[PDB]
Amino acid sequence: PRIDMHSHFFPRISEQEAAKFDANHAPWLQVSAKGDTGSIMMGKNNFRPVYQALWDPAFRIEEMDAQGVDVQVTCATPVMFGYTWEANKAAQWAERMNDFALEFAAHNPQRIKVLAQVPLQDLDLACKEASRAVAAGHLGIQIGNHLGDKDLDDATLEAFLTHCANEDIPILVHPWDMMGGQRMKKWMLPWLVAMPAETQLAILSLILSGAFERIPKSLKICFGYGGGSFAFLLGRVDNAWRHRDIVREDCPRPPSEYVDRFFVDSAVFNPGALELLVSVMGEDRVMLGSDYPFPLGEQKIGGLVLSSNLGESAKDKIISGNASKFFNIN
Amino acid sequence: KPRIDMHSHFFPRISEQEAAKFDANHAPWLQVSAKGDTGSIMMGKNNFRPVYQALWDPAFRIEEMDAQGVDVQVTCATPVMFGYTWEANKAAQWAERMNDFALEFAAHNPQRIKVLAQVPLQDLDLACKEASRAVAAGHLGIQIGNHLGDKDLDDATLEAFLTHCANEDIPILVHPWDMMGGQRMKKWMLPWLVAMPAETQLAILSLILSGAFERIPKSLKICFGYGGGSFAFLLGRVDNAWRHRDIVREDCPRPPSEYVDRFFVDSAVFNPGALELLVSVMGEDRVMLGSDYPFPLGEQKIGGLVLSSNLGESAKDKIISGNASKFFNIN
Ligand SMILES: [Mg+2]
Ligand SMILES: [Zn+2]
Ligand SMILES: [Zn+2]
């Protein structure tokens, strides 16, 4: 069996639909008359051209069959987060998007699973949408590491993760591209540099703030893309904790001891990096993800994990075993 | 078979009143206590950082080197001394002053203490002149910061400076400083833990992805601090993006991973699995032992991580001594 817990979709909306939310700030799908090709737009302009497999659940069950992929977990493309929008507006938007997600999943609920998006800017609306969308069939939630243009240390954020831990709602955290602001303007430097750094920051912020000593152990939380640069830079973080007062201030154990409080996906695009990742997190805490169906997504889903020299026991937890437990999937 | 540490810092005996003449708020100076074993780097009347004697006392430092089995240490300015935001002429006088201090520091024992120079990088012409002057006077190379405000290493001015050093056979160490982030990562030393390895990665990728290595002569000897930051680990993600996205291929003719033959990194990565990955990405010829001595987060036992890693003995030899002897021309 083979579960891919990192993949994305974008609903078949309309330019007019989106306008009633926002005509030049709300995304929408523009499939051309030629329907095996399209684009995501905002108003007049083109945000992003995209493969058909982003929509069309049957078209996807096709690709999932070519690859050895049985169960896919899919979630919102980051464009639709609306974390910068008005709280009740975004709540309405998240509802619609989450409804679209189930539609997309409805094509085949046994092999296509969905996570929901939430209005993360407002605690109460977020908890509410989290609970609602899960009751309606979502296996969990995907949230951003950012929040529009956000400093990611709020105590409402602990409140939120605690709500999810209590309701047995698993969480996937997925990065944004913003940190160096007006540097990194070329060559997708935001994806190559800013994002892995933002993800490391989201993790360390939970660790070094002592959040894990307050969030119940029942919390199931996973960080996309191998947790960014976290695994590689862990040694430096542990060194700092050991030799500097201010690093220990709110975090009573060594930072590397908290790896048992979270998961990461396997999307690190390199054998050596995967080995190191597994060594750091353990074979129980890494889940296969592909970022499907994007160009950057791994071409042979699971190819990396399979091609490695990890134990056969290890390869199985990563390709199926862990995601089964995490998302409660058969 | 000299054991060489190539990443270390010094700070000169500068008085508050001397530093005031350059900048009453932003020029760093050194305040030493009464017993004289400890002190602080200061900035205006503000305390900047606690330090100890090894930073400013070459005699004391030699004793510590003796106790660590370090035969030769290459040392350079503490990055707070860079002054990249100052008015160019003033920064050029500062650099020459600091560079003379460095040589006086090394003059205690120039067989075991080597120095790299700083340059007024905000003015290309003055930077090039200072680089050449300092190396002529006995510096083995230059240490620079990894960016100048919003100018990364791919900026025409920085590529121009690098080309000058390549043509003059002046080795370069690139050190992170003035980390990105803003108001986002103040506490728990996050700028050191997050922004700095990303800054270093960004510096390396800026050279690679802009095609600057196609334009800079192969004779350039350039080393990046702290193992290249998170560069080695994220290099799969970069090669993938290059393979499947055109705007990434734009100015970079070969796959990014192939440009590892154009630079070096130090070994300060605080973890043996990390160091092993580094060496497999870079090659055993392109990693040099550096410790960040004498700062608190510096390696407590110098070379200790390298000796305790799974690397072959020949790789260990190169990392500990051979690579730096060749890079800095130490003999
Ligand atoms: Mg610029
Ligand atoms: Zn993704
Ligand atoms: Zn340093």
XYZ file of C-alpha atoms and ligand atoms in Angstrom:
664
model
C 0.000 0.000 0.000
C 1.133 3.581 -0.714
C -0.140 6.826 0.781
C 0.922 10.258 -0.496
C 0.033 12.815 2.179
C 1.344 15.890 0.383
C -0.552 17.044 -2.696
C -2.700 19.945 -3.796
C -5.849 20.852 -5.714
C -7.659 23.930 -6.925
C -11.437 23.934 -7.431
C -13.274 24.664 -10.682
C -14.677 28.048 -9.685
C -15.439 31.057 -11.879
C -14.380 34.661 -12.422
C -17.865 35.790 -11.410
C -18.041 33.595 -8.287
C -14.738 34.883 -6.967
C -15.780 38.492 -7.571
C -18.610 38.254 -5.037
C -15.798 37.570 -2.564
C -13.310 39.819 -4.363
C -12.838 40.606 -8.062
C -9.097 41.258 -7.818
C -7.877 39.473 -4.699
C -9.713 36.162 -4.842
C -8.292 33.389 -7.034
C -10.297 31.522 -9.668
C -9.736 28.809 -12.250
C -9.760 29.786 -15.916
C -9.755 26.620 -17.960
C -9.661 27.745 -21.587
C -11.931 26.347 -24.304
C -9.039 23.937 -24.597
C -9.764 22.207 -21.294
C -6.609 20.116 -20.885
C -4.768 23.284 -19.957
C -5.549 26.298 -17.789
C -4.544 28.945 -15.284
C -5.271 30.426 -11.872
C -6.162 34.116 -11.991
C -7.055 36.995 -9.687
C -8.721 39.722 -11.719
C -7.537 40.224 -15.287
C -3.996 38.955 -14.748
C -2.586 35.428 -14.481
C -1.299 34.318 -11.105
C -0.161 30.921 -12.345
C -0.564 28.546 -15.316
C -1.254 24.972 -14.170
C -1.610 21.299 -15.216
C -5.094 19.809 -15.579
C -4.434 17.278 -12.797
C -4.767 20.125 -10.291
C -8.482 19.803 -10.952
C -10.296 16.844 -12.448
C -10.351 14.015 -9.892
C -10.700 11.304 -12.560
C -7.716 12.709 -14.461
C -5.850 12.363 -11.173
C -6.996 8.850 -10.250
C -5.347 8.082 -13.598
C -1.936 9.435 -12.589
C -2.324 7.951 -9.100
C -2.776 4.578 -10.826
C 0.296 4.966 -13.070
C 2.386 5.697 -9.983
C 1.958 3.096 -7.259
C -0.324 5.517 -5.396
C -3.415 4.146 -3.628
C -4.518 6.859 -1.225
C -3.751 10.522 -1.729
C -4.322 13.292 0.776
C -4.862 16.587 -0.963
C -5.343 20.123 0.261
C -5.624 23.738 -0.816
C -3.042 25.428 -2.990
C -1.530 28.239 -0.860
C -3.066 30.941 -3.096
C -6.493 30.286 -1.576
C -5.525 30.820 2.088
C -6.770 34.431 2.261
C -5.003 34.928 5.594
C -4.748 38.610 4.732
C -8.498 39.020 4.201
C -11.219 40.174 6.590
C -11.950 37.551 9.259
C -15.600 36.814 8.497
C -14.989 37.166 4.761
C -12.209 34.570 4.883
C -14.326 32.297 7.071
C -17.010 32.327 4.373
C -14.304 31.719 1.775
C -12.747 28.830 3.720
C -16.204 27.262 3.989
C -16.733 27.443 0.236
C -13.247 26.103 -0.499
C -13.669 23.281 1.994
C -16.993 22.446 0.372
C -15.282 22.308 -3.031
C -12.662 20.015 -1.514
C -15.253 17.455 -0.442
C -16.825 17.676 -3.934
C -13.420 16.879 -5.395
C -13.004 14.050 -2.899
C -16.592 12.876 -3.472
C -15.471 11.532 -6.875
C -13.728 8.800 -4.870
C -13.670 9.263 -1.072
C -11.796 5.968 -0.480
C -8.710 6.916 -2.516
C -8.898 10.707 -2.323
C -8.804 12.358 1.113
C -8.907 16.088 1.854
C -7.663 18.448 4.544
C -9.450 21.733 5.154
C -8.259 25.320 5.240
C -9.108 27.599 8.159
C -9.403 31.398 8.785
C -6.246 31.381 10.919
C -6.423 35.144 11.590
C -9.369 34.669 13.947
C -9.016 32.031 16.688
C -12.691 31.287 17.192
C -13.653 31.153 13.522
C -10.613 28.935 12.956
C -11.501 26.457 15.698
C -15.053 26.496 14.447
C -14.137 25.809 10.815
C -11.618 23.160 11.894
C -14.286 21.277 13.846
C -16.968 21.759 11.188
C -14.881 20.689 8.196
C -13.577 17.578 9.969
C -17.101 16.504 10.989
C -18.045 16.878 7.306
C -15.422 14.380 6.132
C -12.079 16.238 6.133
C -9.285 14.166 7.640
C -7.589 17.244 9.053
C -6.412 20.784 8.373
C -3.638 22.484 6.453
C -2.416 25.780 7.894
C 0.275 28.235 6.818
C 3.427 28.887 8.806
C 2.715 32.590 8.124
C -0.553 34.498 8.521
C -0.548 37.179 5.820
C 2.438 39.211 6.980
C 2.730 37.716 10.418
C 5.083 37.347 13.365
C 4.466 33.686 14.242
C 4.490 33.793 18.056
C 0.940 34.188 19.347
C -0.538 32.521 22.423
C -3.766 32.131 20.455
C -1.759 29.858 18.200
C -1.104 27.554 21.171
C -4.789 27.848 21.981
C -5.524 26.752 18.432
C -3.206 23.721 18.395
C -4.643 22.644 21.766
C -8.164 22.803 20.316
C -7.026 20.527 17.494
C -5.200 18.149 19.834
C -8.359 17.853 21.949
C -10.651 17.177 18.980
C -8.212 14.680 17.417
C -7.759 16.896 14.357
C -4.386 16.271 12.631
C -2.562 19.289 11.174
C -0.335 19.812 8.138
C 1.815 22.989 8.176
C 2.756 24.405 4.784
C 5.161 27.236 4.107
C 5.012 30.793 2.765
C 7.632 32.686 0.768
C 8.466 35.808 2.764
C 11.393 36.763 4.993
C 14.058 38.567 2.979
C 11.349 40.818 1.530
C 13.071 42.819 -1.208
C 15.973 40.418 -1.683
C 15.492 37.043 -3.434
C 13.584 38.525 -6.399
C 14.899 36.009 -8.950
C 15.312 32.300 -9.688
C 12.594 31.269 -7.195
C 14.856 32.177 -4.270
C 11.726 32.456 -2.101
C 11.053 28.738 -2.643
C 14.713 27.734 -2.335
C 15.660 29.900 0.645
C 12.871 31.828 2.348
C 10.447 28.911 2.648
C 12.773 26.253 4.183
C 13.863 28.969 6.639
C 10.260 29.926 7.492
C 9.460 26.287 8.178
C 12.505 25.881 10.414
C 11.371 28.995 12.248
C 7.818 27.661 12.752
C 9.228 24.492 14.353
C 11.903 26.164 16.522
C 9.347 28.760 17.623
C 7.207 25.950 19.017
C 10.230 24.259 20.639
C 12.111 27.262 22.025
C 8.936 28.952 23.345
C 8.166 25.878 25.403
C 4.903 25.380 23.524
C 5.302 21.594 23.561
C 5.326 21.546 27.381
C 1.805 22.998 27.191
C 0.265 21.430 24.071
C -1.198 17.982 24.864
C 0.817 15.004 23.523
C -2.223 13.947 21.491
C -1.370 16.738 19.023
C -0.703 15.302 15.580
C 1.238 17.929 13.609
C 3.334 17.563 10.434
C 5.631 20.090 8.684
C 5.934 20.049 4.927
C 9.095 19.579 2.874
C 11.012 17.635 5.529
C 10.553 20.478 7.970
C 12.695 22.735 5.768
C 16.268 23.115 6.998
C 15.395 22.054 10.576
C 17.056 18.640 10.529
C 20.371 19.906 9.150
C 20.605 22.843 11.504
C 19.479 20.967 14.615
C 23.070 20.415 15.817
C 23.656 24.163 15.831
C 20.425 24.731 17.741
C 21.327 22.077 20.363
C 24.797 23.642 20.671
C 23.256 27.067 21.333
C 20.799 25.680 23.897
C 23.668 23.970 25.742
C 25.942 27.037 25.891
C 23.581 30.033 26.103
C 21.219 31.083 28.902
C 18.710 32.926 26.726
C 18.138 29.922 24.495
C 17.166 27.806 27.543
C 14.885 30.462 29.017
C 11.514 29.000 27.977
C 12.629 25.506 26.887
C 13.604 23.106 29.700
C 14.908 20.192 27.588
C 17.393 20.102 24.725
C 15.582 21.102 21.512
C 16.436 17.840 19.724
C 14.455 15.930 22.406
C 11.202 17.376 21.006
C 11.373 15.523 17.682
C 8.864 13.064 19.222
C 6.208 15.823 19.262
C 5.922 16.285 15.495
C 6.229 14.713 12.046
C 7.604 15.866 8.696
C 7.059 14.747 5.120
C 9.781 13.102 3.019
C 10.062 15.791 0.370
C 13.809 16.616 0.484
C 14.758 15.648 -3.107
C 18.052 13.945 -2.180
C 19.102 10.540 -0.776
C 21.668 11.897 1.666
C 19.233 14.510 2.928
C 16.551 11.844 3.425
C 18.974 9.639 5.419
C 19.885 12.544 7.679
C 16.208 13.442 8.021
C 15.318 9.892 9.090
C 18.271 9.750 11.480
C 16.975 12.933 13.098
C 13.227 12.260 13.187
C 13.110 8.469 13.299
C 11.359 6.056 10.938
C 8.073 6.576 12.814
C 7.935 10.329 12.267
C 8.498 10.789 8.530
C 5.614 10.455 6.029
C 5.794 10.128 2.252
C 4.687 13.268 0.435
C 5.208 14.389 -3.159
C 3.841 17.929 -3.626
C 1.869 16.441 -6.565
C 1.046 17.476 -9.288
C 3.377 20.460 -9.480
C 6.518 20.510 -11.714
C 8.642 20.585 -8.556
C 6.755 17.593 -7.139
C 8.777 14.374 -7.225
C 8.448 12.735 -10.645
C 8.322 9.159 -9.378
C 6.136 9.361 -6.271
C 8.007 7.491 -3.545
C 10.963 6.924 -5.861
C 13.349 8.588 -3.432
C 12.252 6.617 -0.336
C 12.304 3.378 -2.351
C 15.736 4.035 -3.856
C 17.282 4.621 -0.430
C 19.125 2.096 1.723
C 16.932 2.448 4.794
C 15.567 -0.719 6.390
C 12.570 -2.356 4.706
C 10.768 -1.798 7.994
C 11.596 1.897 7.681
C 10.456 2.218 4.062
C 7.053 0.838 5.008
C 6.242 3.233 7.846
C 7.212 6.131 5.604
C 5.342 5.018 2.481
C 2.168 3.886 4.301
C 2.384 2.947 7.987
C 2.787 6.404 9.528
C 0.257 8.289 7.409
C -2.266 5.548 8.262
C -1.934 6.243 11.966
C -1.588 10.006 11.607
C -4.636 10.548 9.415
C -6.638 7.471 10.577
C -6.847 5.999 7.059
C -7.740 2.620 5.557
C 51.639 18.308 9.449
C 50.260 21.585 10.886
C 46.785 21.588 12.418
C 45.075 24.747 11.158
C 41.958 26.546 12.419
C 40.856 28.995 9.677
C 37.764 30.581 11.228
C 38.452 32.695 14.269
C 38.110 36.321 15.279
C 39.952 39.057 17.087
C 39.012 42.461 18.410
C 41.551 45.264 18.888
C 42.195 47.441 21.951
C 40.105 50.402 20.763
C 39.108 53.102 23.237
C 35.609 54.539 23.556
C 37.117 57.881 22.651
C 38.857 56.549 19.512
C 35.637 54.909 18.340
C 33.687 58.118 19.012
C 35.764 59.795 16.305
C 34.289 57.369 13.779
C 30.773 56.971 15.177
C 29.545 57.844 18.666
C 26.721 55.319 18.399
C 27.820 52.664 15.909
C 31.620 52.289 16.117
C 32.520 49.328 18.362
C 35.139 49.556 21.096
C 36.516 47.332 23.809
C 36.083 47.728 27.533
C 38.289 45.470 29.629
C 37.574 44.758 33.306
C 39.965 45.256 36.233
C 41.566 41.804 36.466
C 41.697 41.948 32.677
C 40.610 38.394 31.881
C 37.126 39.422 30.741
C 35.547 42.369 28.962
C 32.832 43.633 26.635
C 32.600 44.866 23.081
C 30.756 48.163 23.286
C 28.782 50.314 20.902
C 28.485 53.919 21.940
C 27.718 53.676 25.656
C 25.824 50.414 25.014
C 27.207 46.987 25.858
C 27.225 44.727 22.769
C 28.797 41.479 23.849
C 30.729 39.830 26.713
C 34.188 38.627 25.643
C 37.339 37.156 27.111
C 41.039 37.841 26.893
C 41.824 35.485 23.977
C 39.893 37.854 21.704
C 42.348 40.742 22.182
C 45.505 39.226 23.744
C 47.731 37.258 21.348
C 50.032 35.943 24.110
C 47.065 34.512 26.016
C 45.666 33.132 22.773
C 48.880 31.211 22.003
C 48.596 29.385 25.353
C 45.047 28.304 24.446
C 46.164 27.241 20.986
C 48.916 25.187 22.660
C 46.326 23.478 24.879
C 44.078 22.709 21.860
C 46.890 21.415 19.686
C 46.283 24.166 17.138
C 49.557 24.950 15.329
C 48.278 27.826 13.197
C 45.194 30.006 13.529
C 43.833 32.301 10.816
C 41.949 35.121 12.490
C 39.933 38.081 11.218
C 37.715 40.948 12.351
C 34.623 40.454 14.430
C 31.808 41.288 11.985
C 30.595 44.149 14.173
C 33.773 45.911 12.981
C 32.704 45.797 9.280
C 31.115 49.269 9.126
C 29.414 48.615 5.791
C 26.771 51.320 6.433
C 29.200 54.108 7.141
C 30.258 56.873 4.781
C 32.802 55.346 2.426
C 35.886 57.444 3.170
C 35.344 57.110 6.895
C 34.877 53.347 6.500
C 38.039 53.171 4.391
C 40.083 54.830 7.192
C 38.465 52.500 9.721
C 39.387 49.397 7.667
C 43.010 50.493 7.336
C 43.130 51.144 11.106
C 41.570 47.765 11.875
C 43.824 46.039 9.368
C 46.902 47.561 10.988
C 45.617 46.396 14.414
C 45.276 42.863 12.974
C 48.903 42.853 11.800
C 50.115 44.111 15.187
C 48.068 41.274 16.760
C 49.706 38.718 14.453
C 53.176 40.281 14.991
C 53.218 38.588 18.381
C 53.807 35.341 16.473
C 53.255 35.524 12.723
C 54.298 31.897 12.315
C 51.227 30.742 14.274
C 48.850 33.713 13.896
C 47.692 34.681 10.428
C 45.238 37.522 9.686
C 42.573 38.260 7.041
C 41.691 41.865 6.252
C 38.367 43.713 6.117
C 37.520 46.122 3.277
C 35.179 49.139 2.844
C 32.866 47.050 0.666
C 30.364 49.887 0.146
C 32.848 51.480 -2.283
C 34.255 49.185 -4.962
C 37.320 51.269 -5.713
C 38.309 51.714 -2.065
C 37.579 48.034 -1.307
C 39.878 46.822 -4.098
C 42.639 49.202 -3.047
C 42.420 48.138 0.617
C 42.363 44.426 -0.310
C 45.565 44.778 -2.322
C 47.298 46.941 0.282
C 46.484 44.675 3.211
C 47.603 41.507 1.434
C 50.846 43.252 0.409
C 51.391 44.178 4.049
C 51.025 40.565 5.168
C 47.351 39.569 5.386
C 46.647 36.183 3.821
C 43.292 37.235 2.436
C 40.086 39.097 3.171
C 36.967 38.413 5.195
C 33.773 40.039 3.923
C 30.118 40.019 4.909
C 27.704 37.982 2.812
C 25.591 40.936 1.642
C 25.507 44.709 1.564
C 21.993 45.753 2.470
C 19.772 44.508 -0.351
C 22.845 43.754 -2.501
C 23.648 40.039 -2.569
C 26.850 38.513 -3.993
C 25.339 38.488 -7.525
C 25.358 42.310 -7.597
C 27.700 43.675 -10.247
C 29.716 45.500 -7.606
C 30.356 42.339 -5.542
C 31.110 40.218 -8.631
C 33.546 42.968 -9.595
C 35.219 42.806 -6.215
C 35.429 39.011 -6.389
C 37.017 39.249 -9.855
C 39.658 41.647 -8.581
C 40.586 39.191 -5.825
C 40.672 36.276 -8.288
C 43.007 38.255 -10.566
C 45.203 39.292 -7.601
C 45.153 35.790 -6.067
C 43.543 37.068 -2.869
C 41.561 34.377 -1.018
C 38.175 35.353 0.458
C 36.230 34.211 3.513
C 32.519 35.103 3.439
C 30.933 35.591 6.844
C 27.219 36.099 7.558
C 26.278 39.367 9.265
C 23.235 41.700 9.595
C 20.804 38.807 9.322
C 17.426 38.989 7.552
C 14.149 38.607 9.471
C 13.181 42.005 10.856
C 10.923 41.848 13.914
C 10.116 38.194 13.285
C 12.835 36.310 15.152
C 14.207 38.303 18.089
C 14.278 35.850 21.015
C 16.261 32.628 21.635
C 19.040 33.661 19.217
C 16.835 32.978 16.200
C 18.878 35.357 13.939
C 21.867 33.070 14.579
C 19.761 29.918 14.402
C 17.524 30.752 11.436
C 18.446 33.886 9.521
C 22.160 33.292 9.384
C 22.297 29.864 7.732
C 19.706 31.137 5.192
C 21.823 34.261 4.476
C 24.830 32.077 3.744
C 22.850 29.743 1.501
C 21.418 32.774 -0.296
C 24.938 34.185 -0.861
C 26.119 30.920 -2.428
C 22.951 30.493 -4.526
C 23.196 34.106 -5.702
C 26.610 33.361 -7.187
C 25.464 30.062 -8.692
C 22.015 30.946 -10.002
C 23.007 34.335 -11.426
C 25.739 32.745 -13.524
C 28.443 34.683 -11.691
C 30.714 31.628 -11.645
C 30.642 31.710 -15.444
C 32.045 35.247 -15.332
C 34.447 34.991 -12.397
C 37.854 33.433 -13.184
C 38.351 29.867 -11.959
C 41.332 31.202 -9.978
C 38.957 32.635 -7.332
C 39.483 31.045 -3.908
C 36.364 31.693 -1.843
C 35.163 30.078 1.391
C 31.797 30.365 3.106
C 31.478 30.335 6.894
C 29.541 27.773 8.971
C 29.499 24.965 6.444
C 27.763 27.086 3.857
C 24.752 27.482 6.126
C 21.920 25.228 5.023
C 23.274 25.041 1.462
C 24.343 21.386 1.414
C 21.069 20.080 2.764
C 18.793 22.121 0.465
C 20.871 21.483 -2.661
C 18.533 18.687 -3.839
C 15.629 21.151 -3.795
C 17.733 23.578 -5.856
C 18.783 21.039 -8.492
C 15.122 19.897 -8.753
C 13.874 23.443 -9.290
C 16.606 24.066 -11.874
C 15.642 20.867 -13.722
C 11.927 21.681 -13.941
C 11.621 25.503 -13.947
C 12.864 27.803 -16.717
C 13.263 30.969 -14.650
C 15.745 29.018 -12.485
C 17.740 27.929 -15.567
C 17.765 31.514 -16.926
C 21.363 32.437 -16.152
C 22.818 29.177 -14.908
C 24.082 26.903 -17.743
C 25.005 23.843 -15.616
C 23.093 22.103 -12.828
C 23.721 24.028 -9.572
C 25.269 21.056 -7.746
C 28.173 21.040 -10.209
C 29.406 24.447 -9.035
C 30.649 22.986 -5.744
C 34.027 22.772 -7.500
C 34.181 26.600 -7.446
C 34.081 27.244 -3.659
C 34.964 26.007 -0.160
C 33.209 25.880 3.202
C 34.362 25.657 6.792
C 33.445 22.678 8.960
C 31.562 24.409 11.761
C 28.251 22.470 11.479
C 27.966 21.129 15.078
C 26.888 17.584 14.116
C 28.680 14.543 12.674
C 25.794 13.493 10.399
C 25.680 17.072 9.155
C 29.423 17.119 8.550
C 29.263 13.805 6.726
C 26.566 15.168 4.416
C 28.646 18.333 3.891
C 31.746 16.387 2.856
C 29.761 14.191 0.434
C 28.270 17.275 -1.215
C 31.483 19.385 -1.197
C 34.219 16.792 -1.445
C 36.986 16.182 1.100
C 39.217 18.730 -0.672
C 36.762 21.609 -0.135
C 36.037 21.637 3.597
C 38.365 23.334 6.058
C 38.398 23.133 9.822
C 37.110 26.335 11.436
C 35.984 26.793 15.021
C 34.682 30.342 15.551
C 37.158 30.734 18.385
C 37.037 32.349 20.824
C 33.293 32.933 20.911
C 31.023 30.976 23.336
C 29.316 29.069 20.496
C 32.756 28.254 19.102
C 33.903 24.615 19.087
C 34.894 23.676 22.665
C 37.409 21.063 21.510
C 38.928 22.310 18.235
C 38.817 19.623 15.536
C 36.816 17.455 17.927
C 33.836 17.118 15.586
C 36.036 16.218 12.653
C 37.941 13.591 14.682
C 34.719 12.029 15.963
C 33.016 11.845 12.553
C 32.879 8.724 10.376
C 35.144 10.315 7.729
C 38.189 8.466 6.415
C 41.593 9.376 7.839
C 42.696 11.018 4.604
C 39.624 13.256 4.580
C 40.277 14.074 8.233
C 43.853 15.075 7.361
C 42.717 17.371 4.551
C 40.006 19.017 6.637
C 42.322 19.517 9.589
C 45.312 20.895 7.671
C 45.917 20.200 4.006
C 43.027 22.163 2.535
C 43.718 25.408 4.454
C 47.490 25.209 3.825
C 46.709 25.274 0.130
C 43.836 27.795 0.305
C 45.652 30.423 2.340
C 49.178 29.494 1.168
C 50.392 28.536 4.664
C 53.716 26.684 4.780
Mg 19.049 44.969 -5.614
Zn 3.052 21.699 -1.346
Zn 32.615 33.689 12.967
